[PDB]
Design a protein around this ligand. Structure first.
Ligand SMILES: *Cc1cc2c(cc1C)nc1c(=O)[nH]c(=O)nc-1n2C[C@H](O)[C@H](O)[C@H](O)COP(=O)(O)OP(=O)(O)OC[C@H]1O[C@@H](n2cnc3c(N)ncnc32)[C@H](O)[C@@H]1O
Ligand SMILES: *Cc1cc2c(cc1C)nc1c(=O)[nH]c(=O)nc-1n2C[C@H](O)[C@H](O)[C@H](O)COP(=O)(O)OP(=O)(O)OC[C@H]1O[C@@H](n2cnc3c(N)ncnc32)[C@H](O)[C@@H]1O
Ligand code: NA
Ligand code: NA
Lengths: 655, 655
């Protein structure tokens, strides 16, 4: 038997995984990072919008602080997030930027002077003072009133990921790629590591550690149309769910982006709309104003996506051999504006769409983008399965609720990596584990048996046809608009698809470098993941954040101010087991109210919200009058935790 | 923390270790072999006499079989061996040769014809039939009547070791050299591996396995004069003794060789005496006939060594700046006889003694050669500490008793490696282990602390002066002739030397590649080992095999037909704890009698020997008359065990 031991095992080499690996290595814990591919190729590298953090450096950032950021995040989540976690987040975000800055991340800087700026509420000019010069800049992104999205030109994710990966190399972390975690080792409700398959040799190896962290990214590829990389299939989520102990949180909370290139799904940054981009239909008609006379194509993403789907349903969509789409017209911004400010958008359309965005229109359509759902954890990042932690998009640390804020996901990866990294490091150093060879042997022989059975199956089903059918079902039934009747149809079919997936047969019989065999065990996992999203989408009879139930348009704060928890305790069952974790309003710093975007009074008000609201107004006013800083007031409304290391306040310009 | 896991951990890369490694790897057990130096440089490579095995191929081998070999071994052991183990041995020896033969070991072959041969009972000519041609040859060695010592010209150990090492490479065994086991990991009386120090980096690493085998060789370097390599310091033995659970068997049973080159200790093969070599004193007087008129310089080694020491004591020894020695005259054999039959002895004397053995006399003196003692095990090779096995010279499997047979030690290494290898393999595959990080951490941090303390000691003692003093004490008091008064003096001084060894201070402070630090922790181990030999030599008031007590000249079969068992249960004690394992005559296939060499009736007869002897004569005659093969008779006298794989009988020429 092959066994590898390390104090801290990290599954996932993206921003969250690598940063967490830094936190454990820097304090003497031997740590291994497992990854499907070279770590600096993770989906994190694709980020081009930026990272949200309240620095308050630039003119449009002036006045910004933890409180403002915190609020956008909570109201953005539609109150489905753990506000305490959101506080831990907003507070540490500033120092994540600065640390990355200290590590070489080439953040775009501010320079004294006036500049051409688009506010589309006034496409006026902005002035940056001299004392702001040389500090980290920010851009308008995510719809926040305060511009706090930091960026490194148009390759933010790229540079960020490279810095963290390089720190890992500097600290001597063990990066092992082309290695896939296919199962978690656990006994008596504690995680002891993972059974891993070497994608090249095909060897099944047991990786044991005192603590295991899953930072496997999103499960976006369970949809046919998605912005995600081809490696975001949620298997990380799956192996956690397959322990029968750990739980998945809000898997039905999937977020879509409105303007990905159709049909490839290659992202066309939000800056297109923000700078003036125009959405047109089959007739070339600018339709957003029709639906949103005020904000027009500058409405919140959530809205735009819905409108685009509505318009298409009204039969005004473009007919294409890959389906219906709409048009994105950026040409009206001028050629000089594109070749300098959107020089990267011009390359995307040429290389992949075969068009010049300054001369032609780009085919677009909303598609799956971010996964709010994930392995459920406490504020420390630990799952119900002791010793198993999760961070980043793969988790449901839950600071996103039902709508993650644009710019908050890459931010969360690094931040959670820092905070969970600490808690994880502490767990590993302090906990003492009892490793039984009998158990290691059970899990390793177990997966060897499984691989063998796959290679020997005489089943007649095709893994690809099964996989493709799954992504169609998800796209057609679990997208932007959902209704009970269709969800039931989807759940039923996904469950049937799951059963047939076990009668798959593959042509290639080898155990090493076998892409066909990879699909063989992955698709079944992807199906169990899809079932949690679909079935959870069916059972949640309300419309919250990204979850829109046509048959239940109003957000139900009475019966649904909770969190969906999925599990699969019985390996023989064919549908996920759902439970709910109620969000206690009494622990909220901000009581459930209007979110800012969309219809109004579109929510069944909960009576305890009102009571709590007063409690808030009361306590706030008494201290606010008694001469008290925003800090003391915050502590009085909702005290949160933070590792000692990140407890410090964030110095800002104008302090 | 650094942890390496394998199913089967082997400490020692000599014949016994490597062969055992083959046995576990060939059956799918991942196995690691740890060694101080490259495995093919082990002391095993030095063997030039040959390997004893009853093939019965050659003329002088004709008639040979398991029974004859078995008897030489038991009577040779002076009845201190486990006869059942000796049976397991003699039976498997033949197949060890043949397997090595199948592996390429270039065994010298037989060729039809007559040849010049020396029997010194008749220096006549020998004839090898045509049906013997091409089969494995044998030579006169070990004093056995039947010539059964197989050899590969004059580098038997060399070729044998290379074949086994190469098989290890072929099977993909993990050979990790410049790695030293400095402590054994154990909890609840079970061995889980070993704490290892990387001699190059200085890293302390924990090697965990389901089974650990110690095949570390002999502890000969605790003497000043020894044939052993500089790496035979018994640390393997020490780490076993330091667990407080495992026991050492007959550590006082040390064997000496009579003709090593003085003072280097470089061996001058027994073929010198056998071919005609003459022993002379300071006056050039051939003295052996004086003491042994019959056998003369052809008496058993045991005798020759004693005579040489007696003669020296009588003041007839040569005075040299390194002490007193005697002379070995091979010149009288002629120049042509040496340059063809002893061409290798001629090189030894020139390169190291600066003399031509065909023109001058070589300075000689008896010196420590083989260690019968070692980690005590059952017939399967397992120690009192479960999961810990031992094989080869490092063990006390006990087939040697108080006098190992010349040609039986390299034979035992490979044989035990095969048999213990099987039992070891079975243990590893079947047993299930519970590895607690708390324990691994205790032992690893424990040895790190120790190294650190060594490097920081302000002690003023010198490790080398302490080490050298130890080897003098052993040479002067625990050699060929021993008496109570002197042994008490030695024990007392060794115990004082041990205490001062803990106040050692070393100049070089680094933790990597530090030969001074190596001596720092090794010498203390060597001292605990010496104490077991010395103190066990003091408490055994009798003269048996290599153990000669002048004050107790007779072999006591009444009070000493037992085995010395040394332990060190309390880390605070300063002297080994001895106990005795009684040898049950009722389980002996051969009752205690005369050994063949030396004085006669020199043993306090045990009454149960006689009773048993009849039981033997009776049972033998009844079956011998009732028409029964030597096999059925053996089974009736003393049934022994053998792994299924080696249960087959040994086909011989003339069957
Ligand atoms: C898709 C996307 C997302 C995105 C974005 C643009 C695109 C095209 N732009 C963003 C932006 O401007 N601002 C922002 O805040 N977020 C943006 N996002 C979303 C964001 O990039 C993600 O939320 C974030 O990158 C998630 O980071 P995370 O560290 O969690 O994950 P990852 O980078 O995907 O890496 C996952 C790693 O896991 C390994 N893996 C996965 N499964 C396994 C298994 N089974 N075994 C072993 N390793 C596994 C992957 O190899 C990978 O390295
Ligand atoms: C010294 C000697 C012995 C000898 C002989 C000639 C000489 C000069 N000629 C012989 C002969 O002709 N016929 C015969 O039957 N025996 C003869 N012998 C004795 C024989 O060679 C030995 O009994 C035999 O070789 C012992 O084999 P074994 O496999 O037990 O041991 P080894 O070869 O010495 O190797 C020991 C290995 O252990 C490693 N080691 C030791 N301590 C440690 C620690 N603490 N940690 C890690 N590794 C360790 C050594 O590196 C070595 O590889
Ligand atoms: Na998530
Ligand atoms: Na021994």
């Amino acid at each position: 038997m092959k066994v590898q031991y390390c104090d801290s095992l990290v599954i996932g080499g993206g921003l969250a995984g690598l940063r967490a690996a830094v936190a454990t290595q820097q304090k003497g814990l031997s740590t291994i990072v497992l990854s499907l591919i070279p770590v600096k190729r993770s989906h994190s590298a694709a980020a081009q919008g930026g990272m949200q953090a309240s620095l308050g450096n630039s003119k449009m950032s002036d006045g910004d602080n933890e409180d403002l950021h915190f609020m956008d995040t909570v109201k953005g989540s539609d109150w489905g997030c753990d506000q305490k976690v959101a506080r831990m987040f907003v507070n540490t975000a500033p120092k994540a930027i600065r640390e990355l800055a200290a590590w070489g991340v080439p953040w775009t800087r501010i320079h004294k002077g006036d500049r051409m700026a688009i506010i589309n509420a006034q496409k006026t000019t902005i002035t940056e003072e001299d004392f702001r010069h040389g500090l980290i800049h920010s851009r308008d992104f995510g719809g926040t009133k305060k511009w706090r999205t930091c960026y490194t030109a148009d390759a933010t994710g790229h540079t960020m990921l490279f810095a963290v990966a390089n720190e890992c190399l500097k600290l001597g972390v063990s990066i092992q790629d082309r290695k896939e975690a296919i199962a978690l080792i656990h006994q008596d409700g504690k995680c002891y590591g993972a059974v891993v398959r070497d994608l090249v040799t095909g060897d099944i190896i047991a990786y044991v550690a005192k603590g295991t962290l899953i930072a496997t990214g999103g499960y976006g590829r369970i949809y046919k149309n998605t912005t995600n990389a081809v490696v975001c299939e949620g298997t990380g989520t799956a192996i956690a769910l397959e322990t029968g102990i750990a739980q998945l949180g809000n898997m039905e909370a999937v977020q879509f982006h409105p303007t990905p290139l159709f049909p490839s799904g290659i992202l066309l940054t939000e800056g297109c709309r923000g700078d003036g981009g125009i959405l047109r239909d089959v007739d070339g008609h600018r339709f957003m104003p029709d639906y949103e006379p005020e904000k027009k194509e500058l409405a919140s993403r959530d809205v735009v996506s819905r409108r685009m789907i509505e318009h298409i349903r009204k039969g005004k969509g473009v007919q294409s051999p890959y389906g219906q789409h709409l048009w994105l017209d950026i040409s009206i911004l001028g050629r000089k504006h594109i070749e300098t400010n959107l020089r990267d958008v011009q390359e995307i359309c040429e290389y992949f769409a075969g068009i010049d965005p300054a001369e032609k229109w780009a085919p677009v359509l909303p598609m799956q983008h971010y996964s709010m759902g994930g392995i459920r954890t406490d504020y420390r990042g630990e799952a119900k399965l002791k010793g198993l932690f999760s961070a980043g998009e793969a988790a449901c640390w839950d600071m996103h609720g039902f709508n993650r804020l644009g710019g908050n996901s890459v931010s969360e990866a690094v931040v959670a990596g820092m905070i969970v990294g600490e808690y994880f490091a502490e767990h590993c150093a302090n906990t003492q584990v009892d490793l039984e060879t009998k158990t290691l042997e059970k899990f390793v022989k177990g997966q060897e048996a499984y691989m063998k059975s796959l290679v020997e199956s005489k089943g007649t089903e095709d893994v690809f046809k099964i996989k493709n059918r799954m992504k169609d079902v998800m796209d057609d039934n679990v997208g932007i608009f959902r209704d009970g009747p269709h969800l039931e149809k989807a759940v039923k079919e996904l469950e049937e698809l799951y059963k047939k997936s076990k009668n798959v047969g593959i042509k290639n019989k080898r155990l090493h470098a076998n892409p066909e065999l990879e699909e063989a065990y992955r698709v079944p996992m992807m199906l169990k993941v899809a079932l949690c999203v679909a079935k959870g989408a069916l059972d949640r009879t309300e419309s919250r954040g990204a979850h829109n139930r046509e048959d239940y348009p109003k957000r139900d704060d009475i019966n649904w101010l909770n969190r969906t928890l999925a599990s699969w305790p019985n390996p023989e069952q064919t549908l996920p087991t759902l439970e709910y974790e109620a969000l206690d309003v009494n622990e909220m710093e901000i009581a459930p109210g209007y979110r800012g975007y969309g219809a109004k009074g579109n929510y069944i008000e909960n009576p305890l919200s009102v009571k709590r609201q007063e409690e808030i107004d009361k306590i706030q006013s008494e201290l606010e009058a008694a001469g008290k800083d925003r800090h003391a007031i915050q502590e009085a409304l909702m005290p949160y935790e933070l590792p000692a290391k990140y407890k410090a306040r964030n110095e800002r310009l104008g302090d």
